[PDB]
Amino acid sequence: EPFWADLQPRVAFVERGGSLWLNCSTNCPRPERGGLETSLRRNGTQRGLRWLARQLVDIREPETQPVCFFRCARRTLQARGLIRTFQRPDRVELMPLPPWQPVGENFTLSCRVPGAGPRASLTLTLLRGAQELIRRSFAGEPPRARGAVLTATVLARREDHGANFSCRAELDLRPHGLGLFENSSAPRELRTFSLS
C-alpha cells in the first residue's frame, strides 16, 4: 500500500450523451508509464509528472468503469472508477385505447417509457383525469436496467365516457443530487357504450 494510483471522481453520474473530466494520479516517485483504459471517446488530455486528466465524451452506456494505471518500478498501480448515465423520460407513451369500449368489460392501459433510467429510479403512474389509478415504483431493479412499462386492467364504467387517460413517468435522481425529471403522455379519450 505504500504507492498507489487514484482516479477522481471515482464515481460519477452523467446525462446520457454527456462528458466528464477524470483525473488519474499517483504518489509513485518516478512513474514510467501512465494511462486511462476506457471504451469512452476522449476529447482532451492534460498531464503532469504524476497525473493524467482526460475528458471523456459522448458517454452513452448505462455503466462503465474506467481503469486508471501507472507503472511504478516493477508494479502496475491502478484505480477503477464508475461512470453511470441517466436518461430523462423524453418518451412517455400510452398505448391506444379501443375505439369503443363496452361498459362493464375490462380494457388494458399500457404506459411505455423507453430508454429512461436508471430503471430503479423511475416511478410510473396511470391516471384517469387527475386521479392516479395505479402507481408503480421500480425500486430494486438492476442498476444497469433502462426503460419501463406499466400495464393495468381497468373496468369500463358509464362515467368514464369521454374521460382522459394518461400516464406519467418520474425519474427521481434527487438522492444523487441531480433532480426530478418528469413527463406525461398525451391524453387518450375513452369512449364507452352498453352492449346490452
Binding site: 508509464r33 494511462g35 483504459e37 476506457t38 471504451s39 471517446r41 452506456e61 468503469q65 474506467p66 481503469v67 494505471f69 502496475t76 491502478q78
Partner: protein, 180 residues
C-alpha cells in the same frame, strides 16, 4: 499442409461489450469457414493477464465454436498485448496443448491496437501474424503504427480493419474538431 492457428483476442476495458461479442462472432465465423481437417485452432483472451479459453485438443474434441467459447467472460482490464503475444509464442504453441510440430503456426490478433505495455515480439518472429483492428481507438496514428508493428510483413497484406458500423461517428468527431 497442417496449420495450427491461434486467435489472440482483446478483452480489455477499451472494447465495448457489443464489440467483444463481435470479436467472438468473428472467431466463430472464421472457424466455420475453415472447418476442415488441416486447420486446428486455439483461442486466448488477453487484457491484463492471458487465458487460453480453448486449446487445439479442445478444438478437436468439441469442434462447435459455440461450445468452445461458451465459458468466455470479458476480462475488462488493461491491454498487455506485447506480453500476450509473447505468451502465445512460448506457452500456447506446445504439444501439451495439442499443437502439431509439423504445422504452420498462425496468429490472428484481434485488438484496437491501444497496447498498455511495451517491448518486442521477437519470440513470435517465426509465427505468421494477421492483425484484425476493431474499435474507436484503432483510428489513432499510434494505434495504427502499433497494429503494423505486430503484423507480419508486408503489413499491408496482414493488417485488416473490421467495420463495426461507426465510421460516420469517427468522421463527425474529426470534422467537429477541424471545422469547429
Amino acid at each position: 499442409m497442417n496449420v495450427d492457428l491461434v486467435f489472440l483476442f482483446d478483452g480489455s476495458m477499451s472494447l465495448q461489450p457489443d464489440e467483444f461479442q463481435k470479436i467472438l462472432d468473428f472467431m466463430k465465423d472464421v472457424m466455420k469457414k475453415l472447418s476442415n481437417t488441416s486447420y486446428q485452432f486455439a483461442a486466448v483472451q488477453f487484457s491484463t493477464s492471458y487465458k487460453t479459453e480453448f486449446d487445439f485438443s479442445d478444438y478437436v474434441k468439441w469442434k462447435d465454436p459455440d461450445a468452445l467459447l461458451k465459458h468466455v467472460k470479458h476480462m475488462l482490464l488493461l491491454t498487455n498485448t506485447f506480453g500476450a503475444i509473447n505468451y502465445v509464442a512460448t506457452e500456447v504453441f506446445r504439444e501439451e496443448l495439442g499443437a502439431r510440430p509439423d504445422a504452420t503456426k498462425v496468429l490472428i490478433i484481434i485488438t484496437d491496437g491501444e497496447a498498455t505495455d511495451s517491448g518486442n515480439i521477437d519470440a513470435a518472429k517465426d509465427i505468421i501474424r494477421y492483425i484484425i483492428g476493431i474499435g474507436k481507438h484503432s483510428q489513432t496514428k499510434e494505434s495504427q503504427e502499433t497494429l503494423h508493428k505486430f503484423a507480419s510483413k508486408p503489413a499491408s497484406e496482414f493488417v485488416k480493419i473490421l467495420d463495426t458500423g461507426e465510421k460516420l461517428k469517427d468522421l463527425f468527431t474529426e470534422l467537429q474538431k477541424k471545422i469547429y
